[PDB]
């Protein structure tokens, strides 16, 4: 009973009844952009690799 009563008092000092409109969306978009930029790079590199591979072989 001691612990629950203390917890209720703590909630009575931290409650305000508003939705708290912070968030973390922008940095997550930026990081996703960077990952797909790296993927583009990896695709083009593989293509160059295969054309050089086929020229070296005759």
């Amino acid at each position: 009973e001691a612990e629950l009563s203390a917890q209720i008092r703590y909630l009575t000092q931290v409650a305000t009844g508003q939705p708290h409109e912070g968030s973390s969306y922008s940095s997550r978009k930026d990081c996703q952009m960077a990952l797909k930029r790296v993927d583009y790079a990896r695709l083009k590199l593989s293509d160059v690799a295969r054309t050089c591979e086929q020229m070296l072989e005759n």
Partner: peptide
């Protein structure tokens, strides 16, 4: 002689290309 020069240089580009391909794939 210039034929061998071209072959060696394109081989060097391919080796480094494979190296950086694996470096970027390790992410």
């Amino acid at each position: 002689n210039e034929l061998q020069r071209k072959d060696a240089l394109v081989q060097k580009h391919l080796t480094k290309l494979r190296h950086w391909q694996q470096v970027l794939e390790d992410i």
